[PDB]
């Protein structure tokens, strides 16, 4: 009989769905073939990026005395970091607002 | 019922529970994280497809994914993502 099923996410130590990522790579018209390690690598990278943004956003929410991450906190996390901001420079975060930034010459004497 | 409209919400929530056990996430931030995951997936997958095509490779392997990650992600973000992906692939290979 079939052995007890283990998700490839569990095999890889990931939260993100290696199986779903593999199916999206196969069905996404990216190549004729998709190697077995490709969805694992991609799920690991997506999970890493998600963890980084969610952790910075949770830090921002905690600093704002809020227990739930909101688009403002995601925006603050992304824009207060050069690497994330350059990754997502061309991106608009809905309901994210903008960083508070007033040019010095506008401030009163 | 309505048709099963899959998303990354549960995986992003699991990652949130790991990185910050006691904080939550609103629906709009949840949708933004879904959009982010989809966008980065599309970027890395498109870049990997282009790498394979440039090299006359029919297959997308973890090595094309690694190169695509190095090309798209900046600075230290790139090497940490590469470390994560390599660790996951090694663990998966060890089963």
């Amino acid at each position, epitope marked *: 009989a079939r052995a007890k099923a283990k998700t490839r996410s569990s095999r890889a130590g990931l939260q993100f769905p290696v199986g779903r990522v593999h199916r999206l790579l196969r069905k996404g018209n990216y190549s004729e073939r998709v190697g077995a390690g490709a969805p694992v690598y991609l799920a690991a990278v997506l999970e890493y990026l998600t963890a*980084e943004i969610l*952790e*910075l956003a949770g830090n921002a929410a905690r600093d704002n005395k809020k227990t739930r991450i909101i688009p403002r906190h995601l925006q603050l996390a992304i824009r*207060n*970091d*050069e*690497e994330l901001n350059k990754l997502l420079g061309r991106v608009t975060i809905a309901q994210g607002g903008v*960083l508070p930034n007033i040019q010095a010459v506008l401030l009163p004497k | 019922k309505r048709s099963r409209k899959e998303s990354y919400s549960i995986y992003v929530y699991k990652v949130l529970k790991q*990185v910050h056990p006691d904080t939550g996430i609103s629906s709009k931030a949840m949708g933004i994280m879904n959009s982010f995951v989809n966008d980065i997936f599309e970027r890395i997958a498109g870049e990997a497809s282009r790498l394979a095509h440039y090299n006359k490779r029919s297959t997308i392997t973890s090595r094309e994914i690694q190169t695509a990650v190095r090309l798209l992600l*900046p*600075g*230290e*973000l790139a090497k*940490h993502a590469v*470390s994560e992906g390599t660790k996951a692939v090694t663990k998966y290979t060890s089963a």
Partner: single-chain antibody
Amino acid sequence: MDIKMTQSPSSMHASLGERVTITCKASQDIRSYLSWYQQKPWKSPKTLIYYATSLADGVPSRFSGSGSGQDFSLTINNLESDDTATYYCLQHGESPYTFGSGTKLEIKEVQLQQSGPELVEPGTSVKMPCKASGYTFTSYTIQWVKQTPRQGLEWIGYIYPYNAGTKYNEKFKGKATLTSDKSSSTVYMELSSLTSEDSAVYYCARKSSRLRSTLDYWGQGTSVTVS
């Protein structure tokens, strides 16, 4: 509520070529954000392990780390002559970064230029510069660490040149003030009202804004001495 970091062996001796284990115990859960630093005497610390398991660049596979949560360990397999130094665990999982007490071990291109020694009278102010080169200046925080023989390493604070953002250790509010200069790629530390306990070596250290990144490159250390 600071995370006190407890290194179990305060000192140890070992012959050449055998394994060594150093244990560092955290006061609270720090979620694998722990680093290990090797400091040979009179020289700046070099990072060995970051994210509690990952070797820093250029570190030989002889060094290895393990653990997560509150218990962490460092292992050196093939002891070589130069492995004699003081080893510090550094947690950066919570806002006041805390170094370990340090384990003295005895056996049988990024540049952060930092100014030379300083002699000052009490009540004065001093301005340690940290000229950084070999990397994109704005992308990495510059972290400042104070080293004394009585208190070990103490984390002062950091400046993020990308947005001039700062964080300071509560022990150094007012005492320290950090500023950046994008044009010269230089970071300056103010010390206000120098006092006797301020005689210490101050290191600027580069740390990426990535949460798992650690203090990776260090300045040579500015030895401030107050009369």
